[PDB]
Write a protein that binds this ligand. Sequence first.
Ligand SMILES: Nc1ncnc2c1ncn2[C@@H]1O[C@H](COP(=O)(O)OP(=O)(O)O)[C@@H](O)[C@H]1O
Ligand SMILES: Nc1ncnc2c1ncn2[C@@H]1O[C@H](COP(=O)(O)OP(=O)(O)O)[C@@H](O)[C@H]1O
Ligand SMILES: [Mg+2]
Ligand SMILES: [Mg+2]
Ligand SMILES: [Mn+2]
Ligand SMILES: [Mn+2]
Ligand SMILES: [Mn+2]
Ligand SMILES: [Mn+2]
Lengths: 381, 356, 374, 375
Amino acid sequence: MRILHTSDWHLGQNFYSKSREAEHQAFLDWLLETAQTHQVDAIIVAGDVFDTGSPPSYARTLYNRFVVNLQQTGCHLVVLAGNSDSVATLNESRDIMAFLNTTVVASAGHAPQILPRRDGTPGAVLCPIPFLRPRDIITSQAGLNGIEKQQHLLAAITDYYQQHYADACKLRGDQPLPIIATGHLTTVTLDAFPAQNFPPADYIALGHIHRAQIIGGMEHVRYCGSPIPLSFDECGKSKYVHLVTFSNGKLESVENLNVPVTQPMAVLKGDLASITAQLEQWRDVSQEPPVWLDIEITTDEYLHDIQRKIQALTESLPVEVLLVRRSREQRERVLASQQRETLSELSVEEVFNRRLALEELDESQQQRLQHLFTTTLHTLA
Amino acid sequence: MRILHTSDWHLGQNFYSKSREAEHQAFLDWLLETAQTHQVDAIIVAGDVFDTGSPPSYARTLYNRFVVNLQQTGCHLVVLAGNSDSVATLNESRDIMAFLNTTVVGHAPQILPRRDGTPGAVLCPIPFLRPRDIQHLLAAITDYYQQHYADACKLRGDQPLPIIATGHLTTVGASKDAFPAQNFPPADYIALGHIHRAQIIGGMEHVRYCGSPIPLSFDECGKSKYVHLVTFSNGKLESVENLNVPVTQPMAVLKGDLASITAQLEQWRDVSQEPPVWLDIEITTDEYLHDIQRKIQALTESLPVEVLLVRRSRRETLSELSVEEVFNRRLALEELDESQQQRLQHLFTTTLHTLA
Amino acid sequence: MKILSLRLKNLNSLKGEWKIDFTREPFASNGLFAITGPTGAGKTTLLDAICLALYHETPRLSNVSQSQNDLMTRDTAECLAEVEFEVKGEAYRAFWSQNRARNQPDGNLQVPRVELARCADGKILADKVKDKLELTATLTGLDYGRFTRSMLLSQGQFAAFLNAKPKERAELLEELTGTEIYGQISAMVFEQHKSARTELEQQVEDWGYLNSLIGSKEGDKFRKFAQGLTLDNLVHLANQQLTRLHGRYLLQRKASEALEVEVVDTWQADAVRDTRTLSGGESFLVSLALALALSDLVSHKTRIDSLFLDEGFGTLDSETLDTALDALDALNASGKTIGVISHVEAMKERIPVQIKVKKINGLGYSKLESTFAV
Amino acid sequence: MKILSLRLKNLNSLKGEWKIDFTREPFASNGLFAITGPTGAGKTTLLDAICLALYHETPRLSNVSQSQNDLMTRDTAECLAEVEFEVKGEAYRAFWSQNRARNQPDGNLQVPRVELARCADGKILADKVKDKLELTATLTGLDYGRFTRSMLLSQGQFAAFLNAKPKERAELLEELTGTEIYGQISAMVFEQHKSARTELETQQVEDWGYLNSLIGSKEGDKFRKFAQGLTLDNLVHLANQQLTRLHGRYLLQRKASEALEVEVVDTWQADAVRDTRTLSGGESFLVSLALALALSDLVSHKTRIDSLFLDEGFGTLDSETLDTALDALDALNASGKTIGVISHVEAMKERIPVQIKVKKINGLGYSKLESTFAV
DNA sequence: CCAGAAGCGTTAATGTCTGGCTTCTGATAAAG
DNA sequence: TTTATCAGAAGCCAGACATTAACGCTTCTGG
Ligand SMILES: Nc1ncnc2c1ncn2[C@@H]1O[C@H](COP(=O)(O)OP(=O)(O)O)[C@@H](O)[C@H]1O
Ligand SMILES: Nc1ncnc2c1ncn2[C@@H]1O[C@H](COP(=O)(O)OP(=O)(O)O)[C@@H](O)[C@H]1O
Ligand SMILES: [Mg+2]
Ligand SMILES: [Mg+2]
Ligand SMILES: [Mn+2]
Ligand SMILES: [Mn+2]
Ligand SMILES: [Mn+2]
Ligand SMILES: [Mn+2]
């Protein structure tokens, strides 16, 4: 039994006043495309299917066109609410979407269901658990502590998974069917989950982590990661919708199809001359999607209108700036001066020299600036 | 041929921070039930469906739970746009609803198939003709119903199917400039929206306003809450039955001074009404509005009712007056003259709608 | 809104965990209660946990976060503050707790945790800060800024309302009653004029005269002409709270563009004089009257049943202080539980219910009674 | 800078030409005096007439000019405050006065006739307003704000110097020393740089700009804050000794930030580094008191001043800290500084018997004091 | 019964500044 | 760990006021 495990779509996310509208749409056809090619029967998207609980109005149309165009294939789909979305937004369309093989289960305490296959045979045992809001399982009491409130939650979700797994043991019975459980949380600053407390399930898809990784050496627990880059630390990385085919009610394979990236992004470190060289690689070559950039300037110089120096570069180029950052975090103040000096006895030549020894500059600009400084002292005299 | 005719639902309506949740939820089950009683062909809603372009998140859940319950009826559903409803609020699931016999709306007309598969009638889906999308504003609306009547006449030809007309607009003559009632194209029926008062317009039976199926404001506390069940005879209208909806949330607009009000307050004493009865008390004194409500909260606690508003329709506060009058009060030190006061008055109401 | 209980631990000088309650054998009356103790040994701190657990912002410190948390005492691992406030019959809870990294007294400061739980069902409503503040605004009906001037009254702040910038006071007035459209129109009209001026870089007359009349950034002009009526409503409640409190003065809205209250001098035959020209005792009593009226303006929407206030009674006169205290007890004929913290020994003889705060003997901390310890 | 005599007429509730002198026998004894009475009897007015006369500005009001004389007692024609004081051994006299229109209780408020004259010389040293302001600035050595946060401390405003924004603290610290040139250097850096950068509508403007974020640009700020840090260190070194003379609770030290701030230190803890915004009320009053004394003692070398007028804040202490603070103030009046204090605290009766005890006329709306002072 | 002077009360040019406002870099809270 | 979002700071424009300088009204007051 094949399943496509993605998550973290983050639909309708504004990205420094830019959108991921066509950036999702050119993925969502590809996700629809690889379904019939690999003959999958039930896609799972485990979490963060919206950015905010009131998404923009097109951000449903990217999602509503997805669920109708799935019905050409007739393949099932499970949608789990993540931490990001308001639960009341996904339960807007829980009841109607049962007509379209789309069990969008938003709230906690839902009943375990049986996945069908393409021929109509039951394909998999599903334990759908969306992101547990802490209100939906635990009640607060008086007399608590600070740390203890986090630990009391952690035991509650743990025995919720032990309870929700035990329902599947009655529902599977004696048939050789695989157990698929979802969730939107973190695992192995003690705000995480211990994976040994996860149930003895056959495969547990998960979410909330954007780096696609195995966790704990158990291959049947896979953070599938985002299908597209949403940041500039993992921009140059790759994205993998997890393909898990099952064999005889057990696990066969974990295939990782890459995603064709439609919107190119890159990050640059260093100083302005190093940014000047890294901008030269886009000179002759052309880009039909305008490439975005992060420019982490680690400069020391003053650099009058540093956003204009960037703006002076990329006028006749197919490169788009989107952000620009500098290490403007530094301290500057007079020391103790051996705890004895008076300001009337120190001349202006001293405290100006006392102010320049705090920076990096050595020789050439210094003998230029001190002439520039002493012109001001004389032009009042 | 049975077709239900509703209009102006205004779902998720803010009502002085009180809700219209249980009003609709005790209506929507009743709505499909009468459709389940009489085995309707199709239902049409004549706009003003949601409240605003950004409805609250619960307001869809009544609307979708209506539609999934409509699938156990097998009846066609046609949803018309309104004046307050955007395209983007109804381009949300414009093709989700295609798989559930639910056509939603610059569109070609269509046929309504019956429960047994036969083509039943002819519909002219007419959303709100925005002048941003279409004297001159009166010019294009007038001939469009002549433009669409030939689209209505020639789509059937010699077929014995009745035509119904839709729309969501305003009409001259109907008590609460507008579309002329005498210029309507003589189709077999005209359903129409945006008028929350239920009445026949012009004296022709085939043109109608069914009003709102629920009371919206206190002032509109009329008992004439109807849904228009129409019947067709092989291409012609048979009749229209006005069906009374049940009431669930009673209101009471008490007027006068405290002498006449407190006498009316004992009418709801010891009756133990299971929904808290709502009020629009209209006091007529010269006392301060922030302190006249001090006596009321003790008087309303004993009764099983909940007050909603207090007004003096005759000092003054900010929760009493309207935006033009304080704007007109702000013209005390401003030279209104002739031209200057007219432009400010006309450009002001433009500015107030820009935030609307 | 009143307070049903309070818990804290290692807040400031009050080391260890302590928990006072407002449904016990003391506080069996709804009378006013005092808090004595040596000066600067945990006295405004018991009234600081009330601000902290409910709005994360003390009167003294601007904000507390993972950075810049001066609040919790040195060589302690965590802090917490927990109230039980009741509106309209139903209890609630709040729980702002913050630990240190690896429970070490010299470590980093982790992300703060909040609850806003219900006390009857036990269920919680907003486990995140940005939802907890806006779900206390719905609940109490009063925002943290409103709470600072219309409920609690901090030390050396009684100059809050009457010595504010007119934008500040007008904004506070627009947050209590009325609607935010009355400045939103000004903001939108400033956008209209900015657009019609960036075009032209009677077209002047489009947003020229109207912009000059009513229209500025963030709702200045028209919001002030709006609150120029709500102030004229509020001054009457100020008068009615004032005459039983201090009969020498009446208030009056001055007919001006910047809304400024104005004293009417009865002992000088209706002399008019500006409100900054008041004595210390008169300014404290008029600010008390104005805040009590300010709470009783939104009393029709939300009942506001509590009023804590710190030292202004050394500032008052020892003869008319008895008149002020008897008027305060006359305001205790409602359910307004009125907390008072000061040092006047005759006043603390008048106030029976004393939460005594014993300062430690050179330890460097403070304590409380064994009834409230935990 | 020690006031010798004060003479006012219709200040607020001191109707009828009330004068005091500190050359009188009860003030000639030591130089420590208290004031008591019912509230609103004009104690702040009595401490207000002197700053009105020396600067035409009060802590309560804003500006008493031709318009909006809110000071003057209701329904009288003229109000005037006049002072004879000393600097460097020799005496001077300031005289501020204001009429109504036509000697009537109401009318057009006229321009305030003022003067500043050397007493026992008959020499009108200053006649108009601005000349009087600048001449008493150079002749007293104190500005307006330096009077109202280092010598006179008004009630409820003692947290001004501790909790001002660092611009209007760097202002006071700049003016306190004779180093006001930085507020011209750093302004002229912006004057050169904005001209050079509007000349581009050039690596030289880049060097001007690299100076321009290395020092202050408009007003003083940056270079000014960098410069007064050493004077703040000198001031907290003085105030540390001043405060441990006062109460052995917290030391002070400067802090490593651009903003000219002072952190406190806890002797009992022995390792405390918190900001001053979380001090207690009584310790904040003692920090403002000792800090003001240190600021006054810093300019000891030129135009040394000897007076202190604490309006209120002693109620914020108790019989366990107030007594210690007054016992330390006794060491200051044993020195040449002659302080004064408004107090409602009856526990300071045994401390200070030298009173300017005032009275009210039965709730009529005026006041009076001992008729041995009145003319 | 009064005119000159002396002072007093009045208005018209100009210098500082308090208040929007805007442009910007800094903090804060949240999803990896 | 990074990304919207608000919050505070520094600088710019400007009208509002403070001040100074000049111009009639009243009043002793002398014959
Ligand atoms: N960072 C801190 N940690 C612990 N205790 C502090 C801290 N800052 C101040 N304190 C102490 O907390 C106490 C608070 O004084 P308090 O009595 O609450 O103020 P007030 O006198 O204005 O009511 C003071 O004794 C002070 O020494
Ligand atoms: N312009 C004025 N007209 C009439 N009365 C005034 C005026 N200014 C002040 N007062 C009276 O003078 C008193 C000033 O009291 P204040 O000296 O401030 O008291 P404290 O010394 O306690 O601060 C107040 O009672 C006030 O009524
Ligand atoms: Mg205190
Ligand atoms: Mg006083
Ligand atoms: Mn996500
Ligand atoms: Mn997530
Ligand atoms: Mn409508
Ligand atoms: Mn309508």
